[PDB]
């Protein structure tokens, strides 16, 4: 009865390459909240602010470089760049405006915030006068004004970021829903994915609000190992700044993390939690600023001890 070729053709009667494409539709939830406050909106806000502030910082830096003579550029190009810099600064200061609700019980901070904002507005106005009017433009005063605006902007952003972050850290501190706890911890992990130093720095925003101590409390007290792992992961992304590391050691965080990796070397309370704990220890030992003699000798000792076993 049977036959190879006939079988091949018999089974090839049905075969055929399908144009696989998914046509499934999707309804967004975000749009149903688009067409105050919640941590989500806050995080979106600090991300938008961060990116805009970066794009502004490259402008401030460029105009600085040009007006300093560090970067070759014609005078008309320089003045035009300064003007559009002022434009960007205006559009940004506009977004820094109606932010009252975040300064709850922060009267000092709001006074400073508002003050420096007014300073930005005024100096911007005077500078724009210096460029638009005035026969012989003073470039010295122009550079000085640009740098001053950079100063004020920096301080302003530091303040508002501190408040915005305080929202999140407090939301973690006073959690009442475990899922939202995980979500928020994940939000601080996301917010510190890339650490900056310029306008968009969130380092001191997390340092001043005692985020490290909060997350360490989460690690200490929580029942679920998953959430503890999440908290360790979030702690590891804060230990880029030395201040946060000091703030970790001050709480005896090193001892706690060290305790995570043993408890008489017990099996339970693992094991991705361990994988994040050693990650924390790693990020910490990465600095290694520029001191200590034993902290290098031991490191090299381990580095060789591993090379022995592997090779």
């Amino acid at each position: 009865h049977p036959e190879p070729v006939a079988s091949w053709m018999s089974e090839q009667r049905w075969a055929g390459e399908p144009e696989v494409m998914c046509t499934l539709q999707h309804k967004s939830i975000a749009q149903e909240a688009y067409k105050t406050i919640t941590t989500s909106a806050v995080c979106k806000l600090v991300r938008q602010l961060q990116q805009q502030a970066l794009s502004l910082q490259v402008h401030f830096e460029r105009s600085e470089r040009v007006l300093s003579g560090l970067q070759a550029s014609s005078l008309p190009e320089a003045l035009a760049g300064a003007t559009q810099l002022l434009s960007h600064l205006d559009d940004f200061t506009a977004t820094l405006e109606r932010r009252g609700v975040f300064f709850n019980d922060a009267k000092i901070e709001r006074r400073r915030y508002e003050q420096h904002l007014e300073q930005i507005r005024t100096v911007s106005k005077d500078t724009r006068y210096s460029l638009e009017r005035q026969h012989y433009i003073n470039l010295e005063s122009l550079l000085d004004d640009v740098q001053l605006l950079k100063r004020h902007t920096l301080i302003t952003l530091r303040l508002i970021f501190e408040r915005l972050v305080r929202v999140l850290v407090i939301s973690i501190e006073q959690s009442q829903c475990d899922l939202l706890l995980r979500a928020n911890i994940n939000m601080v992990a996301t917010l510190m994915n890339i650490d900056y130093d310029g306008f968009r720095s969130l380092s001191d925003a997390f340092v001043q609000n005692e985020a490290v101590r909060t997350l360490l409390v989460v690690v200490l007290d929580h029942k679920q190992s998953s959430v503890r792992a999440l908290a360790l992961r979030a702690l590891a992304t804060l230990c880029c700044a030395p201040q946060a590391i000091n703030q970790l050691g001050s709480c005896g965080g090193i001892e706690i993390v060290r305790d995570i990796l043993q408890v008489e070397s017990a099996g339970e309370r693992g094991a991705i939690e361990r994988r994040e704990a050693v990650s924390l220890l790693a990020q910490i030992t990465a600095a290694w600023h520029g001191s200590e003699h034993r902290v290098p000798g031991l490191r090299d000792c381990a580095e060789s001890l591993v090379a022995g076993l592997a090779a």
């Binding site: 390459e17 399908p18 144009e19 046509t23 499934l24 539709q25 919640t38 989500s40 899922l179």
Partner: protein, 347 residues
């Protein structure tokens, strides 16, 4: 209400990121205590539907698409109702409930036509073509021996809807959509028997695939054309396409597809009585198959190679291929193959 919004937001975020079981957990936790806001709730129902579909829990997917649908109907949101209808119809199609699926997709269609949305109309047509196509391909599986009246009816309807979609896509100028529609039309025509129409539509598909530079789609259309020519008795053209299939298969580093193409060319040249050249392709096929550890394709390879060597005259080789064939058939336990080997090992 607000907590619901946060929960559902993180759930949405998790679903966009791929983690859908966690997203489902968050969504259910959002419904646990929440809105109020009907729009957000409906969105949560939809998201849950697509998430459960993503997870393969088609029951709950169908259910939450049903809830999203009735909520959309209550709001009299015709576009949202169209969306939920499409999704529900899709989930229904995958569940094998082709009739209800067809009804839902038809609702999507009439709504899309009402709103003047030609894009959603196109999507609806493609959906209907899909559900009737799959209906035919399932009915054909229930009774393998013969394409009954039911199967040809379903496939005919699928052809009609696919054609309507093609008209709309040509009218709108969506080249790629025309490509997919042409591919599907070629497949369902191939299943219908009209292999010539299959040739034409697969040709158009190849032209589009060349217009976009998608070599995977090129080897798709080439494979389909190869089959469609095999069943037309035009073995010349069949090999002509199969070779290009193999070329595009090795140009894209596709191991499995390469093996399949080699087996195909082998049988094609077996049919062209060029028994010398077929053994080459079958040998290469056995090489790739034995390489990837494919015992099935190894068995089939031994079968074809044995019969081919018997067709040439070198039975000393064919007997060996038959022995290995029996060994493979007994290894993976095949009641048919073992007998087919035992017959040709003596006779």
């Amino acid at each position: 209400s607000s907590m619901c919004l946060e929960l559902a937001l993180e759930g949405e975020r998790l679903c966009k990121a791929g983690d859908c079981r966690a997203g489902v957990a968050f969504f259910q936790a959002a419904i646990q205590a929440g809105t109020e806001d009907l729009r957000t709730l409906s969105a949560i129902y939809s998201q849950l539907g697509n998430a459960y579909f993503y997870l393969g829990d088609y029951n709950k997917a169908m259910q939450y698409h049903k809830h999203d649908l009735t909520l959309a109907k209550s709001m009299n949101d015709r576009l949202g109702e169209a969306k939920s209808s499409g999704n529900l119809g899709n989930t229904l199609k995958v569940m094998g409930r082709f009739d209800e699926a067809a009804i839902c997709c038809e609702r999507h269609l009439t709504l899309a036509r009402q709103l003047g949305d030609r894009l959603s109309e196109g999507r609806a047509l493609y959906n209907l073509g899909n559900v009737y196509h799959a209906k035919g391909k399932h009915l054909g599986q229930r009774n393998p021996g013969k394409f009954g009246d039911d199967v040809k009816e379903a496939l005919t309807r699928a052809v009609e809807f696919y054609q309507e979609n093609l008209k709309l896509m040509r009218d709108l100028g969506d080249r790629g959509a025309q490509g997919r529609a042409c591919g599907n039309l070629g497949n369902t025509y191939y299943l219908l028997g009209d292999f010539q129409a299959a040739i034409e539509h697969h040709q158009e598909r190849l032209r589009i695939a060349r217009e976009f530079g998608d070599r995977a789609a090129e080897r798709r259309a080439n494979s389909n054309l190869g089959n469609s020519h095999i069943f037309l008795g035009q073995f010349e053209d069949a090999a002509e396409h199969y070779k290009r299939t193999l070329a595009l298969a090795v140009e894209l580093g596709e191991r499995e597809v390469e093996a399949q193409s080699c087996y195909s060319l082998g049988n094609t040249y077996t049919l062209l009585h060029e028994f010398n050249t077929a053994i080459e392709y079958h040998n290469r096929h056995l090489a790739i198959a034995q390489e990837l550890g494919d015992r099935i394709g190894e068995a089939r390879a031994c079968w074809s190679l044995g019969n081919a060597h018997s067709a040439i005259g070198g039975h000393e080789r064919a007997l060996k291929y038959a022995e290995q064939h029996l060994q493979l058939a007994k290894e993976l336990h095949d009641p048919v193959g073992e007998s087919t080997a035992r017959v040709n090992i003596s006779d």
